[PDB]
Amino acid sequence: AQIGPVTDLHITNANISPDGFSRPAVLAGGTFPGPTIAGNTGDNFQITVFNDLTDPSMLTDTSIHWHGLFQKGTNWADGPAFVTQCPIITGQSFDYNFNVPGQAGTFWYHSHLSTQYCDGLRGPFVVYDPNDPNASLYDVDDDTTIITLADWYHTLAQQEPIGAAITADATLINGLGRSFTNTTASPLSVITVQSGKRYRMRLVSISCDPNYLFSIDGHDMTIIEVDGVNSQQLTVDQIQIFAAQRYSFVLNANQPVGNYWIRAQPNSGGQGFDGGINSAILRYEGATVEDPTTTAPTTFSNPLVETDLHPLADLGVPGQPFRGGADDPLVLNLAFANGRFSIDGVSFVPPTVPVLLQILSGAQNAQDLLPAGSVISLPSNSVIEVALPAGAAGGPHPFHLHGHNFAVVQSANNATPNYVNPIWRDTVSIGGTGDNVTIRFTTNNPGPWFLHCHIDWHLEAGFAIVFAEDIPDTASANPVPQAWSDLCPAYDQAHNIST
Ligand SMILES: *[C@@H]1O[C@H](CO)[C@@H](O[C@@H]2O[C@H](CO)[C@@H](O)[C@H](O)[C@H]2NC(C)=O)[C@H](O)[C@H]1NC(C)=O
Ligand SMILES: *[C@@H]1O[C@H](CO)[C@@H](O[C@@H]2O[C@H](CO)[C@@H](O)[C@H](O)[C@H]2NC(C)=O)[C@H](O)[C@H]1NC(C)=O
Ligand SMILES: [Cu+2]
Ligand SMILES: [Cu+2]
Ligand SMILES: [Cu+2]
Ligand SMILES: [Cu+2]
Ligand code: NA
């Protein structure tokens, strides 16, 4: 069952074996992935998170981010540790009480403390639209049509060297899959469809690192949503999905009744499908209960290309139709050396006092904010452009901005900008050497918003900055509850920190 929009959520440690190998984990709702949190557009969500963690090897503190939800007027509920809150300590709970006006689509939730989400705290978050403009394109849209793609590690995250190229041990599709080494024939996930019906498949990358080449043998996929943003229909036979991205696609169950492989090939770790790695099963009602015998093509003739996507609504692009044509045009210098990433020459290391609390206590320019050089102020009611030129090691880097979605004016692997009708989204691959992926948005949401690579190992190694949007209005726009004000005193007392 789905839970929400008002629900408790317990965070616990438990052993799990999603690929046949047992290890301890950090779980929401006792499962991997966690339960789907759901509601309708405009609803009040009140997710009371109970931190019941006791195993220090995966951290006993926690904090949860609601990925892609704008949090307008509720910056304190966004979740990134040391940006918008101190962590919740064990044996305590915290009500994330916010609203989702003007958003409907496919999201997710995850730990936003250190690399803790890798250890298991990740699940889907769906905001349905009772008047969805795409409703007539499918028959079925429910918990059975959500498809999660996850990387899974045998080594615990806090034992991964910082700045290292860290590689997974299994791909999990809906929580199940087979290990790349010592492969055992452990259970594969089954997605069941009825011949003749059309399904809204909600494809969610809950990855900590790899991107996946996703396809379904014999089937094609009609994209209708990108990171929460409704799209024009685009039919493809393969989707390359980067960490934290989401797509909805229509699956027409129009092939002969049978079993078909679902494939998710990561860019690192095990290559291919030997032993049923990187695989799940699409089963038609009435098919024999057996593994598929289908083949992938050698090459995919209609892969997703990001410039082919366009919004369903007339969203346009803010600003003027040329590079630098914005009120506040930025170019970030994105680099890596010696195990650490930097942005504009500064490697991100989380501050002792969360950025939001520094601002509520009176610090009101970005040079007064800690970490020094890691906070850039943005002016209010202004068009912002951010160029993100690639080349830093460990690519392709999927950059994500909190508090906002953005027009993708220039995409990976294509030097031509689009100032007319690009897709809007919240997480974007910045591509390869020489690319100049560029995003635009308007600043109508006061508060400190994290900008970072969503490969969690890279974030841990410093690949982040904070946009302090409209510092002067942050306090009036974001009144804080007493329970939020209590978090830093409790955390600092528990950890013997003076501040
Ligand atoms: C990416 O595009 C940005 C503009 O959005 C380029 O920025 C210019 O960089 C040069 C130096 O390289 C400066 O003289 C300008 O002030 C910058 N802003 C402009 C022209 O609007 C940046 O060079 C591009 N990077 C790559 C790798 O192509
Ligand atoms: C490279 O990106 C550009 C810009 O998004 C794409 O150019 C558009 O192509 C569409 C489809 O033919 C035309 O309707 C638009 O007028 C083009 N816009 C511009 C500004 O040129 C281009 O198709 C992409 N290249 C590839 C190989 O997909
Ligand atoms: Cu996220
Ligand atoms: Cu986010
Ligand atoms: Cu990265
Ligand atoms: Cu983040
Ligand atoms: Na415009």
UniProtKB/TrEMBL annotation:
One GO term (biological process): lignin catabolic process
Protein name: laccase
EC number from the UniProt entry: 1.10.3.2
Binding site for Cu(2+) 1: 65, 400
Disulfide bonds: 86-488, 118-208
Annotated keywords: Copper, Disulfide bond, Glycoprotein, Lignin degradation, Metal-binding, Oxidoreductase, Repeat, Secreted, Signal
Cited Pfam families: Cu-oxidase, Cu-oxidase_2, Cu-oxidase_3
Main localization of the protein described in the UniProt heading: secreted
Compartments where located: Secreted
Family of this protein: Belongs to the multicopper oxidase family.
UniProt binding sites for Cu(2+) 2: 67, 110, 454
Plastocyanin-like domain segment(s): 11-131, 144-287, 349-470
Organism listed in the record: Metuloidea murashkinskyi
Cofactor entry: Cu cation
Entry superkingdom: Eukaryota
GO cellular component assignments: extracellular region
GO MF entry, a single one: copper ion binding
Binding site for Cu(2+) 3: 112, 402, 452
